[PDB]
Symmetry: C2
Subunit: 253 residues, 2 copies
Amino acid sequence: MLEAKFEEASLFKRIIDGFKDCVQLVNFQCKEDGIIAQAVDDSRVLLVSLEIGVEAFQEYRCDHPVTLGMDLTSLSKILRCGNNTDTLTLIADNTPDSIILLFEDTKKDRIAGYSLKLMDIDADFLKIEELQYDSTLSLPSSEFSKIVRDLSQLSDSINIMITKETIKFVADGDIGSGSVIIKPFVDMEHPETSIKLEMDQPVDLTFGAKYLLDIIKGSSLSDRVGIRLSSEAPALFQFDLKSGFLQFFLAPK
Amino acid sequence: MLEAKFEEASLFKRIIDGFKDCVQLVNFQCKEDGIIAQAVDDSRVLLVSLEIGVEAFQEYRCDHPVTLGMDLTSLSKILRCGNNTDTLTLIADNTPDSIILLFEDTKKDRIAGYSLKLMDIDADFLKIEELQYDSTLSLPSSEFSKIVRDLSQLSDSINIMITKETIKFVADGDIGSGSVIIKPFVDMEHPETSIKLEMDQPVDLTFGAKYLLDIIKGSSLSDRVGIRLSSEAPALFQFDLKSGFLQFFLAPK
């Protein structure tokens, strides 16, 4: 048996939102300390990686390991029906054919439950090693969205350059041309607004805008996003959850 | 989908307690206005009949009719695990192979769920008609237990006679012999303790003690029990629930 209950259904919706647009079928591997879910883009360009620990749930129980392979387009249509402020409880038995999603509001005395047919996903193992990066930075995730959403109009590629106190984004296409420079800064009154940069080595990297358009969809999960960049390895984008994260690994062109 | 949630798991335990000892396999027929479950004794002597309306649950949802055929010995072993003060939620999908029982305590942040395999019961339809009875009476259900438990030791049969202000029980066997006479009475300060009798016609009936031993197991569900007796028809024993009842129909020897 598995019982994983979110205080706010919304949390789970937004988790599925960072995923559904760039991968369709994902296994969710539940065990005693919580859930990880990890998927590749088809084209092997984008790896997505979720961790939700026990502490993220209102109440959680998983005595024996289960894999919940579920279609995110389907899952997402069921999640659409929940009030975004409801209780969400996931329930699945020992060897599951199905998952049960149960929206509950103890205030209004309203209860709803939906059933989602699990499927056999059979994905490639993902070997995600822990690395050292040339540069590390954080900023409000919504500042990151706005830059990505704006420059994306102009080019399929966005170039990111990091130099001593400079984070530079550039997009150059057929119609137009964009350039944004942000500087690390400490915000006395509002530290959540700060841009932090830690640079061991300058970096200069190009990424497909389409993939950055996918990653910025993790934004609703966290005020801030952490970007780790390196000349040899894929870049890493991370949105911290209360007791977990959503990570994207992206390869430069 | 079906979601039927009891504020107190205990209510459901005691409901299953009035049943499990005299019938093993019962269908529970859920629909929009709630659940009825009805079973015969093998020997066709004892009919059991449950009604639980919507108002009996904390929250209830059943849009489409489902039959939950379940083994009460099994069901009862799962129910044993619940804290008697917990939340119990029953969940079953559209066409169910299984039922899910979910014990929850929002105070301790403890959650447990168990799965029970439904089975195909195939019972006889029960034609339960509404009748006129010679005599009708109520009394504390626990007074009824004590009389039945005591006289049962002495004889496989208990004789019940009703005359103008007299309710008489008699048991006569090989070892011993018992006689209890209770008189209708109004209890000023404590009306729940009253014995009420309404007699249209005297009655004189014998019943198998074993079957009365089964019926008095409905006692934990209600302070009072109503007994309706007639010379032509089976006797009717009823424990009222908050918005339903548990009935037993019993044929005299």
